[PDB]
Amino acid sequence: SHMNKDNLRSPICCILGGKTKLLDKIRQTNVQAGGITQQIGATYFPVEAIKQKTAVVNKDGKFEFKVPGLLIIDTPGHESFSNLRSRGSSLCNIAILVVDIMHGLEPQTIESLRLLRERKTPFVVALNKIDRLYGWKKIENNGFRESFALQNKAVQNEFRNRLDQVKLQFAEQGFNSELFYENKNFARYVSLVPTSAHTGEGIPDMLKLIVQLCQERMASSLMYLSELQATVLEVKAIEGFGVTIDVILSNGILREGDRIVLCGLEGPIKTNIRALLTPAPYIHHKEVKAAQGVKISAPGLEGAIAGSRLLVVGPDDDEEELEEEVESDLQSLFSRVEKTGKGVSVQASTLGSLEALLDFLKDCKIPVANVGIGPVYKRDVMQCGIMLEKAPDYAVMLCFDVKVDKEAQQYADENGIKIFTADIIYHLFDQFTKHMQEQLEKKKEESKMLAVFPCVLNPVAVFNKTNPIVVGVDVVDGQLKLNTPIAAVKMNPTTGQKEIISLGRVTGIERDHKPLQVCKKGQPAVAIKIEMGGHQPAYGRHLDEKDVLYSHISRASIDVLKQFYRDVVTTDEWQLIIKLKSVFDVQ
């Protein structure tokens, strides 16, 4: 239908990855009426081109276009998600993930999927390589449904089978998917678009779907507007122009000489546009209009942050207010730290990658104490260092797609700071959890050593005076367990101070040559072997049979029992613990 002023500016979409073949098949045209533009970091398709490439799925012409063009960003990475999520449409309105129908779902696609869901970016899936089905009769550049009706029962069955299998793969990952012309709810179901970059089959359906979804669901995003919308897509060093910035012009005009402000590493950048560059069939322009992928040459773009907004200062404008306004996003990222001061340190390459890392970590309930953009330096590493006292566990850095300075790494190694780096978030999660697992295992072993049960031992005999010590004792109170540290306690009458004598830990308990694990009170005497790595005091020289022996409990020891063994320990054992607190001078 037609509503009053229902026409919208051209939407932006990107493909992530069989990707390159697919983009190549899309760009393919016999026209040289048609017309397709190559832009900096992108490819523009005028409406006529789309009409042409969608005609076969639109025989009647009933589908109405309300956009002038489609802009497709072609980058090898996540550049279309460099800005903050709120502003995301400025870089991308909708994405496409490519999945080999022959080979099924793959890890990379799953990562992109999770990231896409996290950013709340709308997307569709191109189910590629359908010509590889056994018995596929291809019709070049035909609509999918059409070619599908022309197939034999066996190949229709093969397609249905492989489709059910891929759907099952999506399901096993927590994604609901449906063939696009069978999708009842786009909000809850991923759309599947069968494609063939080889034969061009499915592609018209796919373009028409992109445009349709953008027109019917994102019209609010795409409305003509008065203000400038320009976003830094990339930062690229170019010979003859130094460090340039690649900008996506969503809306409005840019001119040579314009005063511009943007987010920099060390703070707001104020500069002038030396040159507006487009790819050679580089050609300079006095000005550019949306929708445009444009390169910008200007002094002082070193340390420009990808994902930053581009702001042009008019004569009647406050430059400083615009600086604040453009640094505000990055600042809103910086303010995302725990007030407790306990947490890990993160570093990310762009605004959006940082926001994504922070959103993910927050969702994983992992505390962050320090955040930053760009390469890692010693200073960052020290701020992390504070963690070592504050929280030993959290003294690690999660670094996404960012270089690590030699001295930073050196200081880190010297001080026990772990710097984890990855070009994918979930791997940073992996390294972190591995680290925490190690720390816990360490803690559980230290706890095991400290799990001392209470006992009092009365010596009946001495069999080996030392190295190891072997004594026949009577368990008069509590229970003696293996690995119990044993101490004697002697009071000097003159000094009035106690002399604690540690004997080591019980490695063997035996009655009449029979092995025993424990010996409770009242049970007959036992011979116990107490050995320690350190030199062990001789019974004859510093000891007497007369001297009584107690389980060497510690305040640390007592704490461990309360924390984990409360279910296990008895009441009389607790009383004995208190008495022993008295004997070992413990508060």
Curated annotation (Swiss-Prot):
Region of interest (G5), ranges: 196-198
Entry annotated with the keyword Hydrolase: yes
Q: Does the keyword Hydrolase apply?
A: yes
The main enzyme category here is hydrolase
Q: Which domain of life is it from?
A: Eukaryota
Any one Gene Ontology MF annotation carried by this entry is: translation initiation factor activity
Q: Which stretches does the entry tag as region G4?
A: 128-131
The EC designation for this entry is: 3.6.5.3
Location within or outside the cell = Cytoplasm
**Cofactor dependency:** Na(+); K(+)
Q: How is the cofactor bound?
A: Binds 1 monovalent cation per monomer in the active site, which can be sodium or potassium. This structural cofactor stabilizes the GTP-bound 'on' state, and may also act as a transition state stabilizer of the hydrolysis reaction.
Per UniProt, K(+) binds at G35
GO cellular component, alphabetical, reads: mitochondrion
According to the record, the residues making up region (G2) are 35-39
User: Region G3: start and end of each range?
Assistant: 74-77
Q: What is its main location?
A: cytoplasm
Residues reported to bind Mg(2+) = T20, T37
Q: Where is the tr-type G domain?
A: 8-222
Q: Which residues bind Na(+)?
A: G35
Q: Which residues bind GTP?
A: G18, K19, T20, K21, Q32, G35, I36, T37, N128, K129, I130, D131, A197, H198
List the keywords (alphabetical): Coiled coil, Cytoplasm, GTP-binding, Hydrolase, Initiation factor, Magnesium, Metal-binding, Nucleotide-binding, Protein biosynthesis
The entry assigns this protein to a family as follows: Belongs to the TRAFAC class translation factor GTPase superfamily. Classic translation factor GTPase family. IF-2 subfamily.
Q: What is known about what this protein does?
A: Plays a role in translation initiation. Translational GTPase that catalyzes the joining of the 40S and 60S subunits to form the 80S initiation complex with the initiator methionine-tRNA in the P-site base paired to the start codon. GTP binding and hydrolysis induces conformational changes in the enzyme that renders it active for productive interactions with the ribosome. The release of the enzyme after formation of the initiation complex is a prerequisite to form elongation-competent ribosomes.
In its UniProt entry, what is this protein called? Eukaryotic translation initiation factor 5B
Residues included from the entire protein: 517 to 1116 of 1116
